[PDB]
Symmetry: C3
Subunit: 401 residues, 3 copies
């Protein structure tokens, strides 16, 4: 019995959760009285947290013991717990599952959790430009965690705004949700609106990305995968970076701007000397990082989201963000970008309006700015995640024997 | 006076030694009364240890001060010390070697040690299918550490079951011992049975692997070398991976199952994004790792030794082991595989009989299982090594820097 | 708003400064009575130091608080502070500059400093073979810091004996100073027969190295740049190594020995398994390092400066220095080479005359020798930097308690 799974993407260092930005629907998790925070504030949870993800208008936290906590908007079921008591969504609450959870992901109105034996649970809903499309069945959200139907243990989950990707232990990439911009990587453009002529149920059941064998026999398998808001990056076993999804501002790293429905081997990412280890993306920009402590951006320049300095222009190839210290992880919010450094600091850039930058001000930042303030004093940042209008940090007291 | 050598493969972090598995002949180093340990147990060594290696049925520990300690079967002289005292082979004792040693290696019935000035000592014996062949001289084992007659400084030593490889400062690879499966990489089959008519001096006198450099240069030189039970891997200064020795289950990463007597350039390892840093191998399988925290396995699948999940089948190309956290080092025992993670944990997989897996059970593990236990709590694993029926860990109290 | 910039090269870890070698003109910083130190000696600085650099015959230390301390020969203004008082140049003194400096660099007669917002300050003067040429204007040294502001923030500064290179946030390399050996990589035209002094103003103004990009875009841009005494190495965004400057002993890694006035794409550095991350060089040799902890040398072999062992001969391709632990950084002095290990040790090799090797003796070392002594006991080395006849170390107390 009990055959567990692990993965290099799983997080295990215990920490405290801090939130900042907008909190009108409970996404800050600071109760009914705090609707906005200009600087990071502590979210008290009765356990240490190893992972903290920001969805569109909600926040999902994973404790060290495998307990999921959630807060924010539950109108579509994204919290995965009953919030009938007025205000219960404004503070952390438990998502009840029997098994220990080892990784979570969050999109615009959905949340996913991977158990320690590789089963995937999903709740909330997905939506398309026009409206809700359902979750696992056409047109139906789920308020409760529901098991995704698969026959093989999954080692990683990742979410875009309205799609879920699942990497199996054997390297198959299964995708489900909205496929309108080609972010599922397994649906023709013909079936972009609502599964076209072959129903929604095809989009919402987990099905595998099927390519080639960039040799002569097999179908390509993957060693990792990541999502941006409406796009996906998948790294093959050979080390090639495949992109599918929206690229209307060249955010996928393509020369043209049409959406990519069939996964493309991105030649803008081919092994210079950079082993690509982390990808993230908001609606129209991408921030990624290599194995040598460097972060790069591509996509739309407006409001400083590329972090390349004032007067930066649209990029269609990964462009080095030189102004950062050595980098350990990167993340994007809808119009903001972040890097966590190897020495435990966090830098932010992009659209300032929602107070996601942590400068204390609502001005945009075209160059990376180190986030400071009381709650980051004498602490090391472990991660940063960002949604539509808020940002969630995971921190640890900066050790002192 | 003597010039000292060093190498990136040398270990220098002090810790404690723990052992588990079978201990009939003293290989656990826990006394005459402890014949088996299902979970790791502390071994009383009078000094901190920087390297701990498991031979077939013995264990060799290198202290921070350069002293070698040994415990286990001394029938063949593998302990390199006098075990007249009853039960003295079952607890650590000082190897009789007046040198500051900086690296050790162990085989089925032999042990090697590298001095700080690049001289190699060897003790015990080598055997072929047929029986004991001697050590440095034909038909003579050595109960005491004896100096290898080489006249160039050696920077790294590695052992298979019955062979020794020595990488010089200039990148030559000298090999000696049993060459019956091509593991010396310099002996024709036609003379691999104890050298045939030419007798054992054709196997036991240190001689160097000679490959006529491609692009007609001199001869190929190497930056690293590792051993499996009956095979050797060597990385050229160009970084090409070469393999020689037993590949009856494709453990060398070759298409056929024929022992390789001539070094092969292993095209299966050629990759733009994977830099090969570590190799290990039991009888019939190989576990290796790249520079990006990923471990791969190849060879025989029986009993779960590949760590690729249930129903895994024989592999002939390095195959990602996805169910592991980021990996820092790998090792194999006869029929078992291990990976130490960057965060200080250790996972095991393969044949369970001997209790080497540290699960507490004797069932095989077809996927990696995390080793737990009271001795591992609040400690980080620095290294893991495995022999026929036991496993040896080097650990430290929850690391401070 | 004066937006701050950083870079992965900027040093942040507080330490103590040690010096050794010759101190005739104050470069040891130990006062008027200490003219020579055979082993590392502690130099009292009022604050913790994050970066310690050796100029030709001076030393520049950057405090954690952003202040600069200097000591050594101030005949040309390299110290950037008033040493009218007899002996005041023999001990650390503060440079009066109301800026938070985040990086420094030092040459034969000049020092440069980079502010937290990306502006460069330079002082002293540059010389060519025929004498002093000026600093930013012909024939004019500066005893105080002079601002050099480009249209874009500078993220890294690096110095050779008599040239300064600045890498902008946008990946442009701006060079100035002496160009007699091609180390500016930009006015080949001015050195074709002609003396650099005929277009001297053009050389003392910071101007961009302009390389057309083949199957071209505009021009090539760089992710990093380093200097040797009379040459410069720049790594493009694609990871190609470019070099320009002196190569009379093949130290640039060129087949020929003529000085290279245009950036050369060094095919000797092209290799699928090596990613180059660090470069250093004395007059006639180079010591560089890859992303996998390996250090390499090339150039003149006389006096052991390649660290490849006795009888080494001239090298024109990066040649592995096998006899080192895993490397974290490399440095050169005029005729010596160093490597700091990942475990905090420092190794030296090359010409021993000036007592730069830290052996306690003045003999050459043709292979790497670990630097020991009282001041390195129980301490971890953070950096090493070396000039004409002295060497500067930055160390920290072993991280226990």
């Amino acid at each position: 019995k009990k055959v567990k799974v692990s993965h290099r993407s799983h997080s295990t260092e215990p920490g405290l959760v801090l939130t900042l930005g907008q909190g009108d629907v409970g996404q800050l998790g600071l109760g009914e009285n705090v609707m906005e925070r200009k600087k990071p504030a502590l979210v008290s949870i009765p356990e240490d947290v190893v992972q903290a993800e920001a969805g569109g208008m909600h926040t999902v936290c994973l404790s060290k013991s495998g307990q999921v906590y959630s807060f924010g908007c539950n109108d579509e079921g994204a919290l995965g717990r009953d919030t009938s008591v007025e205000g219960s969504e404004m503070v952390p609450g438990k998502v009840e599952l029997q098994e220990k959870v080892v990784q979570v992901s969050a999109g615009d109105s959905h949340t996913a959790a991977l158990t320690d034996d590789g089963r995937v649970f999903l709740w909330g809903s997905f939506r398309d430009n026009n409206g809700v499309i359902g979750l696992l069945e056409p047109m139906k959200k789920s308020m409760v965690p529901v098991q995704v139907q698969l026959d093989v243990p999954v080692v990683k989950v990742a979410s875009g705004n309205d799609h879920l990707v699942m990497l199996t232990a054997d390297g198959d990439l299964y995708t489900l949700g909205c496929g309108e911009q080609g972010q599922l990587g397994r649906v023709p453009e013909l079936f972009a609106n609502r599964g076209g002529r072959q129903g929604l149920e095809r989009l919402l059941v987990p099905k595998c990305v099927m390519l080639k064998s960039r040799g002569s026999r097999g179908h390509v398998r993957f060693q990792d995968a990541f999502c941006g808001a409406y796009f996906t990056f998948a790294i093959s076993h050979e080390g090639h970076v495949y992109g599918f999804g929206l690229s209307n501002y060249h955010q996928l790293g393509t020369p043209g701007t049409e959406s990519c429905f069939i996964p493309q081997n991105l030649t803008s990412f081919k092994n210079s000397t950079k082993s690509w280890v982390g990808f993230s993306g908001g609606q129209h920009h991408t921030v990624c990082m290599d194995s040598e402590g460097k972060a790069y951006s591509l996509g739309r320049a407006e409001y400083g989201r590329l972090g390349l300095g004032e007067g930066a222009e649209e990029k269609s190839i990964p462009t080095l963000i030189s102004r950062l210290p050595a980098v350990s992880s990167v993340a994007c919010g809808a119009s903001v970008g972040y890097a966590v450094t190897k020495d435990g600091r966090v830098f932010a850039w992009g659209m300032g309006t929602n107070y996601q930058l942590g400068t204390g001000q609502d001005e945009d930042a075209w160059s990376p700015v180190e986030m400071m303030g009381k709650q980051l004093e004498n602490r090391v940042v472990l991660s940063v995640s960002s949604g539509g209008q808020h940002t969630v940090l995971l921190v640890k007291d900066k050790e002192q024997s």
